[PDB]
Design a protein around this nucleic acid. Sequence first.
DNA 1: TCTGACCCCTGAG
DNA 2: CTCAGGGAAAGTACAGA
Lengths: 312, 273
Amino acid sequence: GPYLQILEQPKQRGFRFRYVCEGPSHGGLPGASSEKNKKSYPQVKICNYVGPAKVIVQLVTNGKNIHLHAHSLVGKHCEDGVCTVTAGPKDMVVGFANLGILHVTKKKVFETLEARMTEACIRGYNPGLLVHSDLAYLQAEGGGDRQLTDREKEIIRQAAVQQTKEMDLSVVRLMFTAFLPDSTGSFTRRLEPVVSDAIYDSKAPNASNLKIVRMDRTAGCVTGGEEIYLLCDKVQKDDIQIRFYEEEENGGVWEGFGDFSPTDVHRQFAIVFKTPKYKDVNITKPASVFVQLRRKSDLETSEPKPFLYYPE
Amino acid sequence: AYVEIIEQPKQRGMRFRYKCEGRSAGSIPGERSTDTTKTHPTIKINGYTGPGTVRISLVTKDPPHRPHPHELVGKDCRDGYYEADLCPDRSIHSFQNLGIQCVKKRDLEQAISQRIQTNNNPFHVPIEEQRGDYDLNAVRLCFQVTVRDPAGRPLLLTPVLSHPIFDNRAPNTAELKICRVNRNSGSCLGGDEIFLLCDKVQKEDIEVYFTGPGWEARGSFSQADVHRQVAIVFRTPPYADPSLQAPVRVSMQLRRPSDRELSEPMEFQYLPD
DNA sequence: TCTGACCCCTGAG
DNA sequence: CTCAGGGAAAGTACAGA
């Protein structure tokens, strides 16, 4: 059958959700595989090349229950929260270059929310499972501003209140949807939608890219128990640990961790810890290994840093 | 009959708090108050002792001491200032719950209007002057004390000001503080790198000042060496005697050139060759 | 009783 | 000199003795 598919998931980390006040031109959600200055970008593709096509995209929550997030896609042909493109041309692979993610203020969550839920009802291209399942019966059909039943408009202002209460603004997702040509030339032939990989705001201390900026010492005795001052980027004194590791022949399974309490974390930008005892305190030649910052929550790490172990 | 300050307000360390924080803001420490033994703002009424009242408001730091937008919140504080009756049994009076409540930027005009509409102007400054920019990180306490004259009538004594009190939330006016340090000794030849952890500082306005009798020098480093305002990586200066033959203790402290402020001294020891 | 994390300015190019 | 993109900073929020 005819279905949609994604060719390059959105890079999950390293992007900051810009507030309105922040201002224009700050960046734009990068393509997961932007290994270099290859300026990557997300790209969806319709399998059953149905000549003319219409593919849209709206941001969504990352919890168990998929819903409409309050943040909105700003870049590209993105209007009133969601982006829209065309696929009629020579191919069936749409892309999405340059289009930041606007961060909404907390007070304005409920507002923007209900306003992007109602809009999801008086606007076809928006499903009816992101606003409330009991409304799916509203899928893509016609256009033109009108008033939604006051019987159903209430449950709309009700879903908002119940979905505003636990909305996490530090993470959002992409909800790709493709509509094909119908019988009256109205792109309303909906194809199974597909959500992307969770995008994390490079500003929430618990999803920011970790990094060792410098250490006062890069070598220590295999005996361990040596104090070391390490300077890093924003981190959280309760969700951080310093891991030392080595990749041996039988697959580097050895690791050790810097010893330290949270009071040893200075204003989130520095950590003073004690080196962990190396595996073999009997070596006769220095043993070079690696040190890295690792978030205890998502087990995400920083660029490994070389650390030398020398005989006692 | 005049008001004399016998215990000034500590000038630095306490941050101004906003309304959005705890209902109970800070409490202005004395000046000689120690971590163990705390003291508080204290005045003495010379040439008088008996019944009367005392009011304390906030005026700017500089000369035309006009009403300050901030509020002096705390026990017996209303409309921005504290007011209570003096104790007829004593001439010395201390206040243990004074707190600066800093206003938001966009409520600056409202704040002044409330200063006018409330008749809070200890120095009766022309109203046309209450429009000029206000320094919001420094305020002065103002003691308006009212006694009684022989006719037994209300006698408002001449206003007295304390030292300025600075917003510690602000790096430029903050209390300097070395929190932790890599090592505290090194050769009298200098060149030893030191990792210093400190409270917020502005990289373009900071120094490490080594001091000893007949000897003054500075730690070497560049702004790039200041990590996110809270850590400084520097090199030690060469001690005066290049051939020490016994440890010599000296002082090491943070220095702010803008207002030539200094942090409490940390002990450093220069060792031989 | 208090105290103690959640606007621009550059550096590229 | 523009402009992505970070470093400060202003203002908001609780909690742990």
